[PDB]
Symmetry: C2
């Protein structure tokens, strides 16, 4: 007595499903007497009281009636009178491929670190289809890209899900963004498909240490350079982004003498002077500079600062005699005083030009480069001139030249 | 005439440097006549006017006089009178190892990332010594450590500088801090040395992805669960520190039906319900959960939520008859009305118990599980009782059980 029908969905109104009168055992000679009618809350089917045919009365949407279920049957009861009996009739609703697949969003972003090795797999969102059977069985395809390919796996139930695979190492410094196109096609008839774009954003990793522009920063400055003047400026380049690009500068293997003279800026990297320079103390400074970033990548170089000599030291005069006493009966050629000169500067700034200022019965005789002797030249007499105030002047050969004077008193004593 | 002396430094006052009278060509028979005396701004040496010996007058510190210079000579002039002449005398000051080396600071920290490969080199600060020659030539030693060794290189001038080398990979999750001891010994006599501690702080890198406690979170909840109730709580463990340890939770491959029913917290990871559950619509939910951290390390699992059926649907009654008309001359056994019942619930909650309420000349006969027939049992007469109000009651076998009634009017017609 139970009878099942199998018709496709989305059939036009009035389509023939089956002759219930003949399939049960009725006859056109008794159609009006039994008065067939369908009893169901959903007016999906109707029975013609003329020939006993089962027709379609409303739109039969399998996605709205059954959803994602495999089988889809509609059970109702047909009522016949004289006598009154029940006739259970079931109608299987076949599924057609009338719904294309779809993704969650058209544009999907995916952040991938550039440290990802070749062969790394990243999960991609699958497409959904309200159909069932082969009409929902998706087949995923990816547009050709030299860096990415597609992996299509299956679950334990047979559904396919795509996964992105990396076949070439990523580099943000070469290409930070990639644009992919994923396509999903179902296995129904006709084949309906949809597309979606995948924007791969390459995340930055500290894959590049700082690099100085020069491995040696050499400069020459003056001796009396004012405190707080710019000496040079180191520069380090980092191709990364964010914390992996901020560079800090500092000194290495440095001493306290240098620490009180120079100062290196951590941010700008400009080298200045906080102390005083002196050529007579030190004429060269070899300093090492370290460059650090966020990922603790180090970069080392050397800085050499040469100092030129300036004429800032005056010539010094030293004298010595026999208690500043002279005998009036001394012969021509007798040494009376000894002159010693020296200058702390170098080059022509240290060369001293010694001479005698004023007229006196004495004469300066040069022995070596820095030694002189005050030799008598004229007459001496205590009764006439008892003392002489010899003034010695020394002058260097600098620019500007410095000088210094020193007067010594020489007494004249009686003869024997 | 020029004469040079070579004496060590830090000699006691009055030590003999040399006999200037004999080394030049004088004689004890003429010591007081010439009256020897030293002329220098620094009172480092003196000449004895008795025997003509050159002695030490003050402390001679080579580090204070010459500093870091290789050679160290002191030039002065000795003055003799009757006659007056100059005698240039130089004294070379030999260096002794009377100053130990030293570092900048006793405690030195060094941050090293755990991603450092075996053999990585890290610069260490060198020790400084105010001495010169072999007295300042340092020899660095490192205490034995299973992870670190010492590399000793030399510059172009011969000075040694240490560098730390890594022979075993570092792991912050195993040991975040290391304590090293660096020792510097000079090549003088006696050997003076100093020590310094190096605190190596292992910087954290994303070397551990999130790990779920369970690969499957299965739970069973009721059907009419109130919106906003806790379902379960996923948990992911990350052994890293900082941004590399913060975990965010989200859904993957999810649909709109699920998105309007459940909600996953990104921070706490607690799963709640924002919609309504229904067993008649869907009895199982398989959801995938993704765990992401700062370094974009992914972790996937699955969550299955089973729903139990609740008796929240009342039995439905459907009736049909011959236009609600009965002939008074009907035989015992004639079908008058057809009863159809069904319940949306499952199990014993769907089993329907149909019966007739009130005394009537009718009887309910059960055909199948859900079909009944109202069969006459007694006498009928329109002149006496023209109509009957048959009330059919259906009740399920749930807890608590539901029920529904439906009264149909049956008219009695005359005979033929
Ligand atoms: Ca459809
Ligand atoms: Ca369909
Ligand atoms: Ca489809
Ligand atoms: Ca790069
Ligand atoms: Ca960097
Ligand atoms: Ca990078
Ligand atoms: Ca100067
Ligand atoms: Ca100068
Ligand atoms: Ca000068
Ligand atoms: Ca000393
Ligand atoms: Ca010394
Ligand atoms: Ca030493
Ligand atoms: Ca670890
Ligand atoms: Ca982590
Ligand atoms: Ca770690
Ligand atoms: Ca329900
Ligand atoms: Ca229910
Ligand atoms: Ca029920």
């Amino acid at each position: 007595e139970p009878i099942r029908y199998a018709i496709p969905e989305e059939l036009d109104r009035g389509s023939l499903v089956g002759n219930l009168a003949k399939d049960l055992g009725f006859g056109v000679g008794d159609l009006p007497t039994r008065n067939l009618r369908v009893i169901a809350e959903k007016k999906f089917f109707t029975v013609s009281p003329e020939n006993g045919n089962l027709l379609v009365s409303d739109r039969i949407d399998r996605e709205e009636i059954c959803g994602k279920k495999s089988t889809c049957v509609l059970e109702f009861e047909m009522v016949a009178e004289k006598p009154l009996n029940f006739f259970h009739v079931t109608v299987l609703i076949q599924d057609i491929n009338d719904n294309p697949p779809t993704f969650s969003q058209n544009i999907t972003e995916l952040e991938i670190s550039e440290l990802a090795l070749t062969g790394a797999t990243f999960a991609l969102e699958s497409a959904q289809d309200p159909d069932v059977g082969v009409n929902s069985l998706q087949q995923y395809y990816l547009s050709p890209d030299p860096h990415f390919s597609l992996i299509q796996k299956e679950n334990l139930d047979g559904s396919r899900y795509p996964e992105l695979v990396l076949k070439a190492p990523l580099d943000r410094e070469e290409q930070p963004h990639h644009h992919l196109v994923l396509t999903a096609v179902d296995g129904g008839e006709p084949s309906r498909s949809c597309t979606t774009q995948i924007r791969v954003i390459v995340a930055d990793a500290n894959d590049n240490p700082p690099v100085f522009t020069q491995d040696m920063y050499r400069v020459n400055v003056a001796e009396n350079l004012p405190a707080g003047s710019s000496v040079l400026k180191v520069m380090a380049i980092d191709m990364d982004e964010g914390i992996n690009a901020e560079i800090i500068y500092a000194f290495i293997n440095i001493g306290k003498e240098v620490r009180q003279l120079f100062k290196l800026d951590s941010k700008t990297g400009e080298l200045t002077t906080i102390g005083e320079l002196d050529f007579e103390e030190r004429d060269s400074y070899t300093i090492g500079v370290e460059a650090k970033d966020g990922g603790h990548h180090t970069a080392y170089c050397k800085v050499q600062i040469d100092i030129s000599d300036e004429n800032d030291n005056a010539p010094e005069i030293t004298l010595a005699s026999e208690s500043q006493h002279i005998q009036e009966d001394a012969e021509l050629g007798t040494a009376v005083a000894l002159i010693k000169t020296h200058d702390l500067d170098s080059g022509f700034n240290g060369e001293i030009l010694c001479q005698l200022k004023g007229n006196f019965p004495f004469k300066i005789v040069q022995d070596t480069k820095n030694t002189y002797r005050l030799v008598t030249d004229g007459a001496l007499d205590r009764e006439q001139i008892p003392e002489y105030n010899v003034t010695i002047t020394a002058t260097d050969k600098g620019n500007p030249p410095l000088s210094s004077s020193k007067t010594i008193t020489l007494h004249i004593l009686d003869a024997a």
